[PDB]
PDB file of C-alpha atoms and ligand atoms in Angstrom:
ATOM      1  CA  UNK A   1     -23.655  16.273   5.743  1.00  0.00           C
ATOM      2  CA  UNK A   2     -20.430  17.877   4.519  1.00  0.00           C
ATOM      3  CA  UNK A   3     -17.115  16.025   4.343  1.00  0.00           C
ATOM      4  CA  UNK A   4     -16.077  17.823   7.544  1.00  0.00           C
ATOM      5  CA  UNK A   5     -19.285  16.724   9.290  1.00  0.00           C
ATOM      6  CA  UNK A   6     -18.817  13.156   8.007  1.00  0.00           C
ATOM      7  CA  UNK A   7     -15.300  13.272   9.423  1.00  0.00           C
ATOM      8  CA  UNK A   8     -16.557  14.293  12.881  1.00  0.00           C
ATOM      9  CA  UNK A   9     -19.069  11.412  12.796  1.00  0.00           C
ATOM     10  CA  UNK A  10     -16.358   8.974  11.689  1.00  0.00           C
ATOM     11  CA  UNK A  11     -14.220  10.030  14.653  1.00  0.00           C
ATOM     12  CA  UNK A  12     -16.922   9.387  17.267  1.00  0.00           C
ATOM     13  CA  UNK A  13     -18.013   6.185  15.475  1.00  0.00           C
ATOM     14  CA  UNK A  14     -14.579   4.516  15.275  1.00  0.00           C
ATOM     15  CA  UNK A  15     -13.876   5.361  18.924  1.00  0.00           C
ATOM     16  CA  UNK A  16     -17.234   3.982  20.094  1.00  0.00           C
ATOM     17  CA  UNK A  17     -16.713   0.768  18.138  1.00  0.00           C
ATOM     18  CA  UNK A  18     -13.249  -0.005  19.453  1.00  0.00           C
ATOM     19  CA  UNK A  19     -13.697   1.289  23.014  1.00  0.00           C
ATOM     20  CA  UNK A  20     -16.897  -0.720  23.414  1.00  0.00           C
ATOM     21  CA  UNK A  21     -15.310  -4.110  22.766  1.00  0.00           C
ATOM     22  CA  UNK A  22     -14.072  -4.819  26.284  1.00  0.00           C
ATOM     23  CA  UNK A  23     -13.971  -3.576  29.862  1.00  0.00           C
ATOM     24  CA  UNK A  24     -14.606   0.140  30.217  1.00  0.00           C
ATOM     25  CA  UNK A  25     -16.921   0.769  27.284  1.00  0.00           C
ATOM     26  CA  UNK A  26     -15.880   4.402  26.962  1.00  0.00           C
ATOM     27  CA  UNK A  27     -12.120   3.821  26.890  1.00  0.00           C
ATOM     28  CA  UNK A  28      -9.588   2.007  24.716  1.00  0.00           C
ATOM     29  CA  UNK A  29      -7.554  -0.635  26.532  1.00  0.00           C
ATOM     30  CA  UNK A  30      -4.227  -1.695  24.995  1.00  0.00           C
ATOM     31  CA  UNK A  31      -5.700  -4.465  22.845  1.00  0.00           C
ATOM     32  CA  UNK A  32      -8.436  -2.126  21.579  1.00  0.00           C
ATOM     33  CA  UNK A  33      -5.990   0.686  20.782  1.00  0.00           C
ATOM     34  CA  UNK A  34      -3.708  -1.807  19.008  1.00  0.00           C
ATOM     35  CA  UNK A  35      -6.474  -3.098  16.734  1.00  0.00           C
ATOM     36  CA  UNK A  36      -7.741   0.412  15.985  1.00  0.00           C
ATOM     37  CA  UNK A  37      -4.235   1.382  14.808  1.00  0.00           C
ATOM     38  CA  UNK A  38      -3.620  -1.823  12.830  1.00  0.00           C
ATOM     39  CA  UNK A  39      -7.048  -1.949  11.152  1.00  0.00           C
ATOM     40  CA  UNK A  40      -7.911   1.727  10.760  1.00  0.00           C
ATOM     41  CA  UNK A  41      -4.555   3.495  10.367  1.00  0.00           C
ATOM     42  CA  UNK A  42      -2.661   0.944   8.250  1.00  0.00           C
ATOM     43  CA  UNK A  43      -1.862   3.544   5.575  1.00  0.00           C
ATOM     44  CA  UNK A  44      -0.548   6.129   8.069  1.00  0.00           C
ATOM     45  CA  UNK A  45       1.219   4.129  10.819  1.00  0.00           C
ATOM     46  CA  UNK A  46       3.421   1.025  10.699  1.00  0.00           C
ATOM     47  CA  UNK A  47       1.605  -2.103  11.857  1.00  0.00           C
ATOM     48  CA  UNK A  48       2.112  -2.875  15.547  1.00  0.00           C
ATOM     49  CA  UNK A  49       3.711  -6.354  15.890  1.00  0.00           C
ATOM     50  CA  UNK A  50       5.502  -5.987  19.243  1.00  0.00           C
ATOM     51  CA  UNK A  51       3.930  -5.720  22.687  1.00  0.00           C
ATOM     52  CA  UNK A  52       6.574  -3.161  23.599  1.00  0.00           C
ATOM     53  CA  UNK A  53       5.244  -0.921  20.821  1.00  0.00           C
ATOM     54  CA  UNK A  54       1.670  -1.053  22.137  1.00  0.00           C
ATOM     55  CA  UNK A  55       3.034  -0.344  25.625  1.00  0.00           C
ATOM     56  CA  UNK A  56       4.955   2.704  24.431  1.00  0.00           C
ATOM     57  CA  UNK A  57       2.031   4.023  22.370  1.00  0.00           C
ATOM     58  CA  UNK A  58      -0.362   3.757  25.309  1.00  0.00           C
ATOM     59  CA  UNK A  59       2.205   5.408  27.596  1.00  0.00           C
ATOM     60  CA  UNK A  60       2.337   8.375  25.215  1.00  0.00           C
ATOM     61  CA  UNK A  61      -1.417   8.758  24.766  1.00  0.00           C
ATOM     62  CA  UNK A  62      -2.425   8.076  28.385  1.00  0.00           C
ATOM     63  CA  UNK A  63      -2.277  11.342  30.349  1.00  0.00           C
ATOM     64  CA  UNK A  64      -4.418  10.496  33.415  1.00  0.00           C
ATOM     65  CA  UNK A  65      -2.912   7.136  34.366  1.00  0.00           C
ATOM     66  CA  UNK A  66      -5.694   4.593  34.030  1.00  0.00           C
ATOM     67  CA  UNK A  67      -3.635   2.758  31.446  1.00  0.00           C
ATOM     68  CA  UNK A  68      -6.404   3.420  28.918  1.00  0.00           C
ATOM     69  CA  UNK A  69      -7.108   5.926  26.167  1.00  0.00           C
ATOM     70  CA  UNK A  70     -10.289   7.930  26.779  1.00  0.00           C
ATOM     71  CA  UNK A  71     -11.986  10.122  24.195  1.00  0.00           C
ATOM     72  CA  UNK A  72     -10.030  13.283  25.023  1.00  0.00           C
ATOM     73  CA  UNK A  73      -6.775  11.337  24.694  1.00  0.00           C
ATOM     74  CA  UNK A  74      -7.920   9.752  21.430  1.00  0.00           C
ATOM     75  CA  UNK A  75      -8.706  13.224  20.073  1.00  0.00           C
ATOM     76  CA  UNK A  76      -5.179  14.298  20.978  1.00  0.00           C
ATOM     77  CA  UNK A  77      -3.916  11.257  19.047  1.00  0.00           C
ATOM     78  CA  UNK A  78      -6.022  12.180  16.004  1.00  0.00           C
ATOM     79  CA  UNK A  79      -4.675  15.747  16.149  1.00  0.00           C
ATOM     80  CA  UNK A  80      -1.102  14.360  16.306  1.00  0.00           C
ATOM     81  CA  UNK A  81      -1.749  12.253  13.208  1.00  0.00           C
ATOM     82  CA  UNK A  82      -3.511  14.998  11.225  1.00  0.00           C
ATOM     83  CA  UNK A  83      -0.726  17.436  12.102  1.00  0.00           C
ATOM     84  CA  UNK A  84       1.965  14.908  11.091  1.00  0.00           C
ATOM     85  CA  UNK A  85       0.161  14.558   7.747  1.00  0.00           C
ATOM     86  CA  UNK A  86      -0.365  18.311   7.348  1.00  0.00           C
ATOM     87  CA  UNK A  87       3.408  18.550   7.866  1.00  0.00           C
ATOM     88  CA  UNK A  88       4.358  15.592   5.659  1.00  0.00           C
ATOM     89  CA  UNK A  89       2.903  17.597   2.761  1.00  0.00           C
TER      90      UNK A  89
ATOM     91  CA  UNK B   1      -9.285   4.448   2.862  1.00  0.00           C
ATOM     92  CA  UNK B   2     -10.601   3.412   6.271  1.00  0.00           C
ATOM     93  CA  UNK B   3     -13.245   5.802   7.588  1.00  0.00           C
ATOM     94  CA  UNK B   4     -10.686   7.161  10.063  1.00  0.00           C
ATOM     95  CA  UNK B   5      -8.067   7.819   7.365  1.00  0.00           C
ATOM     96  CA  UNK B   6     -10.754   9.461   5.225  1.00  0.00           C
ATOM     97  CA  UNK B   7     -11.572  11.682   8.193  1.00  0.00           C
ATOM     98  CA  UNK B   8      -7.942  12.711   8.641  1.00  0.00           C
ATOM     99  CA  UNK B   9      -7.634  13.600   4.972  1.00  0.00           C
ATOM    100  CA  UNK B  10     -10.944  15.503   5.020  1.00  0.00           C
ATOM    101  CA  UNK B  11      -9.797  17.668   7.945  1.00  0.00           C
ATOM    102  CA  UNK B  12      -6.642  18.701   6.070  1.00  0.00           C
ATOM    103  CA  UNK B  13      -8.501  19.263   2.811  1.00  0.00           C
ATOM    104  CA  UNK B  14     -11.335  21.380   4.217  1.00  0.00           C
ATOM    105  CA  UNK B  15      -8.884  23.585   6.096  1.00  0.00           C
ATOM    106  CA  UNK B  16      -6.894  24.279   2.952  1.00  0.00           C
ATOM    107  CA  UNK B  17     -10.078  24.799   0.893  1.00  0.00           C
ATOM    108  CA  UNK B  18     -10.884  27.827   3.034  1.00  0.00           C
ATOM    109  CA  UNK B  19      -7.517  29.010   4.330  1.00  0.00           C
ATOM    110  CA  UNK B  20      -6.298  29.448   0.762  1.00  0.00           C
ATOM    111  CA  UNK B  21      -9.079  31.833  -0.262  1.00  0.00           C
ATOM    112  CA  UNK B  22      -7.502  35.104   0.893  1.00  0.00           C
ATOM    113  CA  UNK B  23      -4.550  36.598   2.660  1.00  0.00           C
ATOM    114  CA  UNK B  24      -2.112  34.148   4.130  1.00  0.00           C
ATOM    115  CA  UNK B  25      -3.177  30.893   2.505  1.00  0.00           C
ATOM    116  CA  UNK B  26      -2.148  28.883   5.605  1.00  0.00           C
ATOM    117  CA  UNK B  27      -4.407  30.471   8.216  1.00  0.00           C
ATOM    118  CA  UNK B  28      -8.106  31.130   8.380  1.00  0.00           C
ATOM    119  CA  UNK B  29      -8.821  34.847   8.625  1.00  0.00           C
ATOM    120  CA  UNK B  30     -12.246  35.859   9.950  1.00  0.00           C
ATOM    121  CA  UNK B  31     -14.003  35.741   6.574  1.00  0.00           C
ATOM    122  CA  UNK B  32     -12.466  32.331   5.721  1.00  0.00           C
ATOM    123  CA  UNK B  33     -13.449  30.935   9.125  1.00  0.00           C
ATOM    124  CA  UNK B  34     -16.965  32.357   8.899  1.00  0.00           C
ATOM    125  CA  UNK B  35     -17.766  30.573   5.644  1.00  0.00           C
ATOM    126  CA  UNK B  36     -16.050  27.312   6.634  1.00  0.00           C
ATOM    127  CA  UNK B  37     -18.499  27.242   9.559  1.00  0.00           C
ATOM    128  CA  UNK B  38     -21.528  28.404   7.593  1.00  0.00           C
ATOM    129  CA  UNK B  39     -20.982  26.043   4.625  1.00  0.00           C
ATOM    130  CA  UNK B  40     -19.282  23.030   6.165  1.00  0.00           C
ATOM    131  CA  UNK B  41     -20.841  22.918   9.645  1.00  0.00           C
ATOM    132  CA  UNK B  42     -24.409  23.926   8.754  1.00  0.00           C
ATOM    133  CA  UNK B  43     -25.800  20.838  10.521  1.00  0.00           C
ATOM    134  CA  UNK B  44     -23.740  21.172  13.714  1.00  0.00           C
ATOM    135  CA  UNK B  45     -23.525  24.904  14.330  1.00  0.00           C
ATOM    136  CA  UNK B  46     -25.853  27.860  14.056  1.00  0.00           C
ATOM    137  CA  UNK B  47     -25.170  30.008  11.002  1.00  0.00           C
ATOM    138  CA  UNK B  48     -23.039  33.081  11.788  1.00  0.00           C
ATOM    139  CA  UNK B  49     -24.641  36.360  10.704  1.00  0.00           C
ATOM    140  CA  UNK B  50     -23.164  39.024  12.980  1.00  0.00           C
ATOM    141  CA  UNK B  51     -19.722  40.560  13.133  1.00  0.00           C
ATOM    142  CA  UNK B  52     -19.884  40.210  16.919  1.00  0.00           C
ATOM    143  CA  UNK B  53     -20.159  36.418  16.522  1.00  0.00           C
ATOM    144  CA  UNK B  54     -17.401  36.134  13.885  1.00  0.00           C
ATOM    145  CA  UNK B  55     -15.320  38.190  16.314  1.00  0.00           C
ATOM    146  CA  UNK B  56     -16.129  36.085  19.361  1.00  0.00           C
ATOM    147  CA  UNK B  57     -15.579  32.755  17.579  1.00  0.00           C
ATOM    148  CA  UNK B  58     -12.172  33.902  16.326  1.00  0.00           C
ATOM    149  CA  UNK B  59     -11.338  35.301  19.781  1.00  0.00           C
ATOM    150  CA  UNK B  60     -12.145  31.882  21.238  1.00  0.00           C
ATOM    151  CA  UNK B  61     -10.102  29.892  18.712  1.00  0.00           C
ATOM    152  CA  UNK B  62      -7.093  32.207  18.339  1.00  0.00           C
ATOM    153  CA  UNK B  63      -4.814  30.779  21.052  1.00  0.00           C
ATOM    154  CA  UNK B  64      -1.612  32.484  19.827  1.00  0.00           C
ATOM    155  CA  UNK B  65      -3.196  35.927  19.391  1.00  0.00           C
ATOM    156  CA  UNK B  66      -2.338  36.704  15.763  1.00  0.00           C
ATOM    157  CA  UNK B  67      -5.983  37.283  14.784  1.00  0.00           C
ATOM    158  CA  UNK B  68      -6.202  34.201  12.546  1.00  0.00           C
ATOM    159  CA  UNK B  69      -6.880  30.497  13.067  1.00  0.00           C
ATOM    160  CA  UNK B  70      -3.963  28.293  12.069  1.00  0.00           C
ATOM    161  CA  UNK B  71      -4.093  24.526  11.573  1.00  0.00           C
ATOM    162  CA  UNK B  72      -3.368  23.634  15.199  1.00  0.00           C
ATOM    163  CA  UNK B  73      -6.102  26.008  16.364  1.00  0.00           C
ATOM    164  CA  UNK B  74      -8.458  24.505  13.783  1.00  0.00           C
ATOM    165  CA  UNK B  75      -7.692  21.022  15.090  1.00  0.00           C
ATOM    166  CA  UNK B  76      -8.587  22.260  18.596  1.00  0.00           C
ATOM    167  CA  UNK B  77     -11.873  23.594  17.171  1.00  0.00           C
ATOM    168  CA  UNK B  78     -12.575  20.188  15.604  1.00  0.00           C
ATOM    169  CA  UNK B  79     -11.715  18.548  18.945  1.00  0.00           C
ATOM    170  CA  UNK B  80     -14.309  20.813  20.606  1.00  0.00           C
ATOM    171  CA  UNK B  81     -16.999  19.836  18.126  1.00  0.00           C
ATOM    172  CA  UNK B  82     -16.261  16.123  18.192  1.00  0.00           C
ATOM    173  CA  UNK B  83     -16.065  15.967  21.946  1.00  0.00           C
ATOM    174  CA  UNK B  84     -19.505  17.596  22.214  1.00  0.00           C
ATOM    175  CA  UNK B  85     -20.881  15.049  19.747  1.00  0.00           C
ATOM    176  CA  UNK B  86     -19.281  12.196  21.708  1.00  0.00           C
ATOM    177  CA  UNK B  87     -20.626  13.428  25.042  1.00  0.00           C
ATOM    178  CA  UNK B  88     -24.066  13.462  23.389  1.00  0.00           C
ATOM    179  CA  UNK B  89     -24.380   9.899  22.093  1.00  0.00           C
ATOM    180  CA  UNK B  90     -22.858   8.794  25.415  1.00  0.00           C
TER     181      UNK B  90
HETATM  182  C1  DCD C 101       4.010   9.385   5.244  1.00  0.00           C
HETATM  183  C2  DCD C 101       2.931   8.948   6.172  1.00  0.00           C
HETATM  184  N1  DCD C 101       2.255  10.135   6.757  1.00  0.00           N
HETATM  185  C3  DCD C 101       2.275  10.008   8.211  1.00  0.00           C
HETATM  186  C4  DCD C 101       3.705   9.956   8.711  1.00  0.00           C
HETATM  187  C5  DCD C 101       0.906  10.193   6.282  1.00  0.00           C
HETATM  188  S1  DCD C 101       0.463   9.189   5.030  1.00  0.00           S
HETATM  189  S2  DCD C 101      -0.062  11.668   6.548  1.00  0.00           S
HETATM  190  C1  DCD C 102     -25.843  16.594  15.683  1.00  0.00           C
HETATM  191  C2  DCD C 102     -25.506  15.218  16.143  1.00  0.00           C
HETATM  192  N1  DCD C 102     -24.492  14.613  15.240  1.00  0.00           N
HETATM  193  C3  DCD C 102     -24.842  13.213  15.018  1.00  0.00           C
HETATM  194  C4  DCD C 102     -24.548  12.798  13.591  1.00  0.00           C
HETATM  195  C5  DCD C 102     -23.197  14.700  15.846  1.00  0.00           C
HETATM  196  S1  DCD C 102     -22.821  16.012  16.994  1.00  0.00           S
HETATM  197  S2  DCD C 102     -21.954  13.738  15.295  1.00  0.00           S
HETATM  198 CA1   CA C 103     -12.875  -0.682  26.248  1.00  0.00          CA
HETATM  199 CA1   CA C 104      -6.155   7.650  30.145  1.00  0.00          CA
HETATM  200 CA1   CA C 105      -5.743  32.313   4.757  1.00  0.00          CA
HETATM  201 CA1   CA C 106      -3.848  32.199  15.737  1.00  0.00          CA
END
């Protein structure tokens, strides 16, 4: 597989791992989203150390009101990050 | 890098690999898009060999109408591909 294909796989893999920890196995609850950001985006985003930060991040990502981040919403988050990086440079 | 950070960097790098080839170096024109797909998505998508298909794929991705695929449009393309992959293993 190409680097682009490996990237696509990485995206579905990391989501599956974190979303599958608790509750709805196809969505990220707050604790799951928090750990994904802290463990997997530590070089891009400041570490989350306040519950009010996780609350605000979920509020931003959650567009259908289940209080969770589904795959579509996670993809929007990834696009936000990749764009912010494409713009940082 | 974490696998996710690697993925983010790869997306940026592959886009610039191809977008820089010709023309504007910040958008994918049809020929740039065609070979990104044929070379870098050869395991996920059928190889493009017609003009009609190059045309239709660009028509689909070109949300702002300028005839090229910019980074935001490319990210939407990637979102399409990844979502299809996710719906599959699920
Ligand atoms: C400067 C950090 N940036 C995100 C704001 C990335 S490393 S792409
Ligand atoms: C072709 C299936 N592939 C699995 C590696 C994805 S769509 S990620
Ligand atoms: Ca979950
Ligand atoms: Ca949601
Ligand atoms: Ca270009
Ligand atoms: Ca366009």
